[PDB]
């Protein structure tokens, strides 16, 4: 028995949160002898080259960047990279000491795409201003993530991805002051480094950059508080200064001139900000607990230009700070670095289709 309008039977997709070993894809070159290219070639796949996603209309999905097993896997890969790449001269770990050759090697991060294998898929939030924990009402499916450079560093997030609208801040718990505040900029700020032991940053641009962040923070902590930035409260050299790699050498830059501002406190300058920097042969490990010593720098000319696309902050707070909040540079857990890129993704398991009911 039929009537007028042709009834349609739909085969609706069905998936479920899951975990599996993903593979990766890169534009690595088999003729480049730099470590990232060498590693990527040995463990990755050629690229896209015209990526497309399957938008899923009127679908809502819940995410949780702070519990994304994609991060744990990427972390292990970047660790596994440094193991065969940056060979230190000395390795101190657990009452144990090791000595080995330590050849200087070209070292520049190359974008990596993490892809779902046969049977799985990766949901992706298309909502531009998304905090990373909660419902996304604009998801879609992808084969592979975007280009993610394994930039290891603290305080400032380099060569990353900008927010598509306004400055975004993300935290597993804004209330808990022990928790990092991953920040995403909508406009990159160039930091030009040199082996001469300093780093340049446009003063006026970085000034506005802070006003944006400040306004986003003042919004999160009640529209009435004064936002102040201060220098690292102390810790290891890799935390207290803007620690970062640049051409095989580890740089430790003083960042106090960056974070000495006071905002929303209603009561001559320098052309650009110059940061005191210094390479170090003896560094703390980020992989695990321990130290490592490296060989002396090669040539004097060491230039590295990068884009500041993000920040790792921490708040002070306490049962005393009323009418104002204090924020200092931070970081250290390289997973936050990963989560600043893998925040909109989520790997899912695909299973048999389900048919749709009829209501009106």
């Amino acid at each position, epitope marked *: 028995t039929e009537k007028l309008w042709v009834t349609v039977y739909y085969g609706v997709p069905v998936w479920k949160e899951a975990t599996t070993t993903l593979f990766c894809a890169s534009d690595a070159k088999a003729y480049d002898t730099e470590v990232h290219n060498v590693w990527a070639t040995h463990a990755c796949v050629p690229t896209d080259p015209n990526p497309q996603e399957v938008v899923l209309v009127n679908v809502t999905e819940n995410f949780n960047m702070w519990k994304n097993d994609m991060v744990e896997q990427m972390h292990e890969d970047i660790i596994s990279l440094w193991d065969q790449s940056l060979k230190p*001269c*000395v390795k101190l770990t657990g009452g144990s*000491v090791i*000595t*080995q*050759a*330590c*050849p*200087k090697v070209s070292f520049e991060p190359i974008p990596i795409h993490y892809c779902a294998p046969a049977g799985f898929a990766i949901l992706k939030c298309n909502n531009k201003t998304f905090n990373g924990t909660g419902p996304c009402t604009n998801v879609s499916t992808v084969q592979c993530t975007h280009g993610i450079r394994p930039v290891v560093s603290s305080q400032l997030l380099l060569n990353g991805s900008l927010a598509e609208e306004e400055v975004v801040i993300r935290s597993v718990n804004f209330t808990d002051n022990a928790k990092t505040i991953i920040v995403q900029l909508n406009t990159s700020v160039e930091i030009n480094c040199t082996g001469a032991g300093h780093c340049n940053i446009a003063r006026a641009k970085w000034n506005n950059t802070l006003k944006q962040i400040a306004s986003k923070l003042r919004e999160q902590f009640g529209n009435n508080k004064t936002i102040i930035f201060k220098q690292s409260s102390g810790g290891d*050299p890799e935390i207290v200064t803007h620690w970062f790699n640049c051409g095989g050498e580890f740089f430790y830059c003083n960042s106090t001139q960056l974070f000495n501002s006071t905002w929303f406190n209603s009561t001559e300058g320098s052309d650009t900000i110059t940061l005191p920097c210094r390479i*170090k*042969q*003896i560094i703390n490990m980020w992989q695990k607990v321990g*130290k490592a*010593m*490296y*060989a*002396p720098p090669i040539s004097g000319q060491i230039r590295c230009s990068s884009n500041i696309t993000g920040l790792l902050l921490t708040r002070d707070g306490g049962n005393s700070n009323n009418e104002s909040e204090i924020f200092r540079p931070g970081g250290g857990d390289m997973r936050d670095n990963w989560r600043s890129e893998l925040y909109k993704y989520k790997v899912v398991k695909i299973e048999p289709l389900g048919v749709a009911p009829t209501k009106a």
Partner: antibody
Framework: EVQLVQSGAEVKKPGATVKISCKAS????????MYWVRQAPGKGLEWMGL????????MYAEKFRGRVTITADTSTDTGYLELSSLRSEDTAVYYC????????????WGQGTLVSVSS | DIQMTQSPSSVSASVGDRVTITCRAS??????LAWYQQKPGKAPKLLIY???TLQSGVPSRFSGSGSGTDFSLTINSLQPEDFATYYC????????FGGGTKVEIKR
């Protein structure tokens, strides 16, 4: 101009703990590593350790780990060196060196500090 | 640690003679080596750094070569004030010294 002026000779009994100094001048003290070397009577040179005064990062030779300690009072431009559980074979001259020109070798040296350890 | 082994332990030579002493690391250390001279009763004197680079104010007849593990210090026209004990030294991280090589006079 540049110089490293150590302390005077010292006599100790086995089991004691000596701590000599090395006041430095002629350059920015806290910007450069400092190294310690000892030389037994009529025997070859023997490195002991180093230190970056800024972060107090230290390194020791295997023959001294967990028995030697190198520090550096940045305010007085002075470096020290401690040796716990002294023995009879620790009798030697102790030099301190530095490299204010960063050639990765010992350019400047101290006059030496004779440490005699016996019963 | 990494071992520095230099030989011979002793070598006798006349003036004007040319002498070669060699060093050898148990593990690759690139060009990070240093040579010292030391006369009895005084502190060592830097001769060569970076394995080949001559220290300022040092006679041109001094020169070292090698890279990686095998190194060598060489004096051309041997002089009266060149008779002493010479040491090599790892300089990339640790600073282990070689056994030592005494260059005494021949008669």
């Amino acid at each position: 101009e540049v110089q490293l002026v150590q302390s005077g000779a010292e006599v100790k009994k086995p089991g004691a703990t000596v701590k000599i100094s090395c006041k430095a001048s002629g350059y920015t003290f806290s910007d450069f590593y400092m190294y310690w070397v000892r030389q037994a009577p009529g025997k070859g040179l023997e490195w002991m350790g180093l230190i970056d005064p800024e972060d107090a990062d230290t390194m020791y030779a295997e023959k001294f780990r967990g028995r030697v300690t190198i520090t550096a009072d940045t305010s007085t431009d002075t470096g020290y060196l401690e040796l716990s559980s002294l023995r009879s074979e620790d009798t030697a001259v102790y030099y301190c060196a530095a490299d204010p020109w960063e050639l990765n070798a010992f350019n400047v040296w101290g006059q030496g500090t004779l440490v005699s350890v016996s019963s | 640690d990494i071992q520095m082994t230099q030989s011979p332990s002793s070598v006798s030579a006349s003036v004007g003679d040319r002498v070669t002493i060699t060093c050898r690391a148990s593990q690759d250390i690139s060009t990070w080596l240093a040579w010292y001279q030391q006369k009895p009763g005084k502190a060592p004197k830097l001769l060569i750094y970076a394995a080949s680079t001559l220290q300022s104010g040092v006679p041109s007849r001094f020169s070292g070569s090698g890279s990686g593990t095998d190194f060598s210090l060489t004096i051309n026209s041997l002089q009266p004030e060149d008779f002493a004990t010479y040491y090599c030294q790892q300089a990339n991280s640790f600073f282990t010294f070689g056994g030592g090589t005494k260059v005494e006079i021949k008669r």
